[PDB]
Paper text:
We also crystallized the TNKS SAM domain, which again required a polymer-breaking mutation. TNKS SAM D1055RT1, equivalent to D902RT2, produced two crystal forms in space group P21, diffracting to 2.5 Å (crystal form 1) and 2.9 Å (crystal form 2), both with six molecules in distinct asymmetric units. The TNKS SAM domain was highly similar to that of TNKS2 (left). For both TNKS crystal forms, non-crystallographic and crystallographic symmetry gave rise to left-handed helical filaments established by EH-ML contacts. The repeating unit consisted of six SAM domains with pitches of 83 and 79 Å, almost twice as long as for TNKS2. Unlike for TNKS2, where protomer contacts relied on crystallographic symmetry only and were therefore uniform, the TNKS SAM EH-ML contacts varied substantially. This was apparent from the merely approximate 6-fold axial symmetry and the variable tilt and twist between adjacent SAM domains. We conjecture that the variable relative orientations of SAM domains reflect filament flexibility. However, the equivalent residues (D1059T1, K1066T1, and K1081T1, respectively) mediated binding between a subset of protomers in the TNKS SAM crystal structures. Thus, contacts not seen in all SAM-SAM pairs are still generally relevant, probably occurring in some, but not all, configurations of the flexible filament.
Author numbering: 1027 to 1089
The structure:
């Protein structure tokens, strides 16, 4: 799922996190279960980035 995940990242303006998501093989299904502690674990060190992603999945899969 690098198709919807890079489109998702681009939508949040977090295109630079692509390499992490590819390396760690993170799909949107994987991401949907990840909170702050899990994203810290894969190298997303900025609170604001993790916040953007977490809220980003909520909008995407709850609307």
């Amino acid at each position: 799922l690098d198709m919807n995940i890079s489109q998702f990242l681009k939508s949040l303006g977090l295109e630079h996190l692509r390499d992490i998501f590819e390396t760690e093989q993170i799909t949107l299904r994987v991401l949907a279960d990840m909170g702050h502690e899990e994203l810290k674990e894969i190298g997303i060190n900025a609170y604001g980035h993790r916040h953007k992603l977490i809220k980003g999945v909520e909008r995407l899969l709850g609307g």
